[PDB]
Each structure stands twice: as structure tokens, then as C-alpha cells.
Amino acid sequence: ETVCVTGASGFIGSWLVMRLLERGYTVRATVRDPTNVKKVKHLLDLPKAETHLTLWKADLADEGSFDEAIKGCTGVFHVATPMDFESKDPENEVIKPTIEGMLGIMKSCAAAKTVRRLVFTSSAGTVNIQEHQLPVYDESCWSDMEFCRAKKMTAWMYFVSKTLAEQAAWKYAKENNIDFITIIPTLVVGPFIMSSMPPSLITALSPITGNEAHYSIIRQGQFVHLDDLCNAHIYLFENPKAEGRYICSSHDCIILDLAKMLREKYPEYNIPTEFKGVDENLKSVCFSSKKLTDLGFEFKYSLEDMFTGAVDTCRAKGLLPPSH
Numbered sequence: 001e002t003v004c005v006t007g008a009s010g011f012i013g014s015w016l017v018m019r020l021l022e023r024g025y026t027v028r029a030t031v032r033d034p035t036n037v038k039k040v041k042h043l044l045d046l047p048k049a050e051t052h053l054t055l056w057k058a059d060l061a062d063e064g065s066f067d068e069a070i071k072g073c074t075g076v077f078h079v080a081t082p083m084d085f086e087s088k089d090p091e092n093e094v095i096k097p098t099i100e101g102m103l104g105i106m107k108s109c110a111a112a113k114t115v116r117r118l119v120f121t122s123s124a125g126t127v128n129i130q131e132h133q134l135p136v137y138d139e140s141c142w143s144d145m146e147f148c149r150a151k152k153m154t155a156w157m158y159f160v161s162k163t164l165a166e167q168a169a170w171k172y173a174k175e176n177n178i179d180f181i182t183i184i185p186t187l188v189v190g191p192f193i194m195s196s197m198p199p200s201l202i203t204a205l206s207p208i209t210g211n212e213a214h215y216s217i218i219r220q221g222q223f224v225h226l227d228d229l230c231n232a233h234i235y236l237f238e239n240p241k242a243e244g245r246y247i248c249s250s251h252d253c254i255i256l257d258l259a260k261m262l263r264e265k266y267p268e269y270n271i272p273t274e275f276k277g278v279d280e281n282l283k284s285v286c287f288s289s290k291k292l293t294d295l296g297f298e299f300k301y302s303l304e305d306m307f308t309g310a311v312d313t314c315r316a317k318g319l320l321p322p323s324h
């Protein structure tokens, strides 16, 4: 069957396309710019690309731009999203196109008549952005927008756009009887096929690069392997019993435990031993994937698997130095 993957050039998007083509799907992959060789070469080099992959030019900012790609598809994976954390105009450059792009794709789907299920890749930032952290989060939990806008932590604008897009999407879905599923990943770590630094790995490997601004996301961190996440996407698209939101998260630990793991695996890098405002008594915060595992889904990868995959790929591609 024929599925549309939005944001196919990205970290998650490109791996998903790979796994979909591997599974025998016909894939329509969207990108903003098909003349960009660094964005498309990795898609075209995929096994089955010549015969089973087409590229479509589309932007979330343009009304109706996903109309042609979606017509004829039996499913849609909406993975694309504005990823700028440092935007000087957050409302127009990030928040607004995320929500209207999302609703636009849902309408593009309704207009197609062929789409049997829309799978939206949401974000853990729609779940646990509040002042007090619960010990365990599930699918009933939503982020606090007032707190998010006021605190203005790293990625606040991104957290707001994702939260607002998902809530708007559920409203549209309930009112128009659209078979709609969302997947909520935590921090996605692993090897990848794209040629530039995946945004999440800026966060995940902060302990190695010393990027302190990203510490706030991993302070009480939750993680999932790229390949487990993409298999969860395919699983929930194919599983007829699937409904509502699904958390997809396999591990949790505080920055201290993560930095420990990395020092032990990578002695060549300068990884801190102490982090300001963080003690051994800091509670680990868990995202519960029980709804997903209850369906029959199995995670296959460990925290060590994720990070070795990520660092090894970064090295291979010259995105991390060999040592410090």
C-alpha cells in the first residue's frame, strides 16, 4: 500500500521511510526543497527507492501544499515540524505553521477519501511541561501552557507549538470522525542516515559537547531508540485495535546517570562529573509506555545501544570530534 511521510529528510522521517520501504510499502516522501542534495541523496540511495519512493515538494506554511501527495494514500505519517528553538518571531515562524500545517494535513486527508489512518508524531513536551514533575507520566497528562510561556525554558516555543497542534488535531478528529493516532516520543537517540546533526542529538550528546542550555531537557531525562520509535509508528498504523495517544519511551534516568554511562563508554571525551542543581537524590521521572506494550509492541534496544549508535554515527560523519 501507499503511504505519505512528511518531513522525510529528517532524523525520524528518513529512518521511517527506510523501514517502510523495507516492509514493502510504496512511500510518498515530502520535503521542502528537493534540489537540496544533502537532504535527498540519503533517501534516493535507499533500497527500493527507484521503484517505490517518490518525492513531493511541500511546506507547512503553504495552505493545501500536501493535497497532491496525500490523494491516493492509504495512510499518512505526519513527522515534519518547524525545529528552531532560537527563533526571534516564535508565534509566526514556529507556533502558527505547526498548528495550521497540522490542520491542513488533516483536511488534505479528509479531502483525499483514501486515507484510512493518520499517525501524528507528537512530543513528550506536550506531556510533562509543568512546574512540579510527577514520578510517572501517562497519556492522560498534558503540558501547562501558562507555565511554559512564562518560564521560557530551552525549547519552550517548540513545546507550545506541539502541544497546541496536538490538542487542535484531536478536536478536528473527534468532530469529523477521522481515524487519528498520535505517538509521543521522548528523547530520540540512535544511529541515523541523514548527513547533518539531528536536533535531538544536540540535546542527547550535550554532556559531551558541553551544551549546557540543553541540560534542562535531560536533567530528568527519558529516551527511546530511533529504530524502536519507527517500528512503533508502523505498528500503530497497522494495528486496528490502536486508538488515541501513545507514549513511546523505553528508558529514564537523571543527567548524572547518563553522564556516568558516557564517561565509562567514552573516556576520550570531557564529560562532567557534577551538574549544578542536581544531586543523587533527584527523582528519576518516567514516561510509561504501558498502553503501547499492552497492545503487543516490544522495545528491542537499550540505553547503551542508543548512545553508542548516536556517537558512532556522529563520528563516522565528522559531526563529533574523535576525542577531546
Ligand SMILES: NC(=O)c1ccc[n+]([C@@H]2O[C@H](COP(=O)([O-])OP(=O)(O)OC[C@H]3O[C@@H](n4cnc5c(N)ncnc54)[C@H](OP(=O)(O)O)[C@@H]3O)[C@@H](O)[C@H]2O)c1
Binding pocket: 007, 008, 009, 010, 011, 012, 013, 030, 031, 032, 033, 039, 058, 059, 060, 061, 078, 079, 080, 081, 082, 083, 097, 121, 122, 123, 124, 162, 184, 185, 186, 187, 188, 189, 198, 199, 200
Ligand atoms: N527526535 C526527537 O528526540 C523527537 C522527540 C519527540 C518528538 N519528535 C517529533 O518528531 C518529528 C521529527 O523530528 P526529527 O528529530 O526528525 O526532526 P528533524 O530532523 O528536524 O526533522 C524535521 C523535518 O521537518 C521538516 N520541516 C521543517 N519545517 C518544515 C516546514 N515548515 N514545512 C514542511 N516541512 C518542514 C524538515 O524537512 P526539510 O527541511 O527537508 O523540508 C525536517 O527534515 C517532529 O514532529 C518532532 O516534533 C522528535
Ligand SMILES: O=C1C[C@@H](c2ccc(O)c(O)c2)Oc2cc(O)cc(O)c21
Binding pocket: 123, 124, 125, 128, 129, 155, 185, 186, 187, 188, 199, 200, 201, 202, 203, 217, 220, 221, 222
Ligand atoms: O521532541 C523532543 C522531546 C523533548 C523532550 C524529551 C523528554 C521530556 O521529558 C520532555 O519534556 C521533552 O526533547 C527534545 C529535545 C530536542 O533537542 C529535540 C526534540 O525534538 C525534543
